[PDB]
């Protein structure tokens, strides 16, 4: 019924988001590390890199995914705002294998 419909769509979205977060990580990994990047640049880059007709991703989604990734990797990725303004991200070394493990753990805690 309705509860099943809500449940099923939510589960598909959980999978989608986790997939997208791993691609966002791949995108950050491809950039020159150790310099600031604005949220605006990174979110447009995520959308431009991953979007197609059949796999929509919007600016707001990309921004939240990026924020989630920093939240999971706070020891690797920093985020700063001046007076609640534009978010600016920085990182040095990133490790995908650690990230992949942390993602599954965080997904479990949230229940995906």
From Swiss-Prot:
Signal peptide: none annotated. It is found in: Cytoplasm; Nucleus. Belongs to the Cdt1 family. Present with 2190 molecules/cell in log phase SD medium. Associates with the MCM2-7 complex. Interacts with MCM2, ORC1, ORC2 and ORC6. DNA replication licensing factor, required for pre-replication complex assembly. Faithful duplication of the genetic material requires 'once per cell cycle' DNA replication initiation and elongation. Central to this control is the tightly regulated formation of prereplicative complexes (preRCs) at future origins of DNA replication. Required for the recruitment of the MCM2-7 helicase complex to the replication origins. This is Cell division cycle protein CDT1. The gene is TAH11. The chain holds residues 495 to 604 of 604 of the full protein.
